[PDB]
Amino acid sequence: PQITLWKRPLVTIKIGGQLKEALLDTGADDTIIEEMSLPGRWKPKMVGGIGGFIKVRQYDQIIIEIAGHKAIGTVLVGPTPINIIGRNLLTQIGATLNF
Amino acid sequence: PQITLWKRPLVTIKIGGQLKEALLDTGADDTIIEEMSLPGRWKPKMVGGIGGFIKVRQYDQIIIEIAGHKAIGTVLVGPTPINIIGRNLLTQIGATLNF
Ligand SMILES: CC(C)CN(CC(O)(O)[C@H](Cc1ccccc1)NC(=O)O[C@H]1CO[C@H]2OCC[C@H]21)S(=O)(=O)c1ccc(N)cc1
Secondary structure, three states: OOOOOOOOOOOEEEEOOEEEEEEOOOOOEEEEOOOOOOOEEEEEEEEEEOOEEEEEEEEEEEEEEEEEEEEEEEEEEOOOOEEEHHHHHHHHHEEEEEO | EEEEEOOEEEEEEOOOEEEEEEEEEEOOOOOOOOOOOOOOOOOOEEEEEOOEEEEEEEEEEEEEEEEEEEEEEEEEEEOOOOOOOOHHHHHHHHHHEEH
């Protein structure tokens, strides 16, 4: 699909058995998901943006379905105000920015 | 152009007669630029990002050239870690997300 940007580019994602809404975000290096339980081992990490830094749990090799498309990668879990799909997973689904 | 996302999508912008680098950011509603002097009156705005809220100055009807494309619109100025081009100006240059 070709997504115009008059509105936030929100899509449905499936992660750890749950269905969620998330933002397709070319400005995000990594994917960040709101507080949830995911299986496996994790490591703590700090992620910085506007307003400062937040502490997140880094999970590796997680499978996510993005708009019907299977992708695997690192997922950061923490107190984010919005679920964000960042470049680590956008590349896997072949997303491009075009103008 | 068609831009892939293996690397940050950085472009050159020209604002206030200066050349600067900025991130094309579909996850940003607004365009936010680091501290610099712009003409005219400004208005106050609060911007909420991943780590908290920041106060910025809002300037309207600012001419900015984005990777060679001329856009005219609202720019926010404040302590952002990186210049960000958000959807308000991405739509002016006709950018879309495709996959
Ligand atoms: C600051 C830039 C370099 C990075 N951000 C991504 C984002 O797309 O720039 C962010 C994604 C985001 C969206 C909404 C809430 C929180 C984060 N939006 C954002 O800060 O936008 C600001 C300006 O415009 C307003 O609209 C959105 C919120 C304001 S970030 O969320 O801090 C971020 C940083 C690191 C990683 N791995 C993932 C995300």
